[PDB]
Design a protein around this ligand. Structure first.
Ligand SMILES: CC(C)C[C@H]1COc2cc(F)ccc2N1C(=O)c1ccc2c(c1)NC(=O)CO2
Lengths: 247, 10
């Protein structure tokens, strides 16, 4: 089918600024509009990254679009967890170099409990001492974690890609079991962490869909397009989360 | 043609 992990390390998008205006009042509307502005800019980076992701080009365009639309919140939240871990040892939420949340901003954003949920994932990165190689493979698995209930246009091509990235994660933990002791132990800690993202992302999307439909919260064109397509699919039960270990 | 379609096909 295929060093694909060395490709993943080299194609990871560069950090982007939020464009946070600290002279404007820190109302929830201003903070959430800033997060949406940042999410839109990051989504352009995600599409460019996915285009050069080994294997992704094999999937038909309709399936590439479906996967990006269903996984956007997972990809962005997992990368937020990574930056928080790398840059602050998971003490703060590192949205961008110019936007680092403390308790004050978590309250001001009107997303305090969701920010605490996010902080709990970054704390798991510290507990596991997650490596960049592990992070990059796991982020590809998140792009491949949510599909239509009735499947994709090219379901077998998708399954081949996801199976091969799972094999890469198993090989990575076989070469490096890290602080978990044995290779199998590491593997199940990583798959348990990947599965835990579905519940956090479901909660993040519920609030995002609420502000999108009831809105001074501004959304960039990139998010208006993704959310307008995704929202009816998620709410009608068409988005099937793939779990390694069923609840 | 959507923004995603534009970006993925360019
Ligand atoms: C901003 C992006 C780098 C990180 C991503 C993923 O992780 C998040 C974790 C959080 F704690 C808060 C926000 C996000 N992110 C969102 O895009 C986001 C999430 C829910 C939302 C909105 C935006 N916008 C709303 O208007 C309200 O609902």
């Amino acid at each position: 089918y295929f060093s694909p992990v060395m490709v993943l390390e080299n194609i990871e998008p560069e950090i982007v600024y939020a464009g946070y205006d600290s002279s404007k009042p820190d109302t929830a509307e201003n903070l959430l509009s800033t997060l949406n502005r940042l999410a839109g800019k990051q989504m352009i980076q995600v599409v460019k990254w996915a285009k050069v992701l080994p294997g992704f080009k094999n999937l038909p365009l309709e399936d590439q679009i479906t996967l990006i639309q269903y996984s956007w919140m997972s990809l962005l939240s997992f990368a937020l967890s990574w930056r928080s871990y790398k840059h602050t040892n998971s003490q703060f939420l590192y949205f961008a170099p110019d936007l680092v949340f403390n308790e004050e901003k978590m309250h001001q954003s009107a997303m305090y409990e969701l920010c605490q949920g996010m902080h709990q994932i970054s704390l798991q990165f510290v507990r596991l001492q997650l490596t960049f190689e592990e992070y990059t493979i796991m982020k590809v698995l998140l792009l491949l974690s949510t599909i239509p209930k009735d499947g994709l246009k090219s379901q077998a091509a998708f399954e081949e890609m996801r199976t091969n990235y799972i094999k890469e994660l198993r090989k990575m933990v076989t070469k490096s079991p890290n602080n978990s002791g044995q290779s199998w132990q590491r593997f199940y800690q990583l798959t348990k962490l990947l599965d835990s993202m579905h519940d956090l992302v479901s909660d993040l999307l519920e609030f995002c869909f609420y502000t999108f439909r009831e809105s001074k919260v501004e959304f960039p064109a990139m998010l208006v397009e993704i959310i307008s397509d995704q929202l009816p699919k998620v709410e009608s039960g068409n988005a099937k989360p793939l779990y390694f270990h069923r609840k | 043609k959507s923004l995603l379609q534009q970006l993925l096909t360019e």
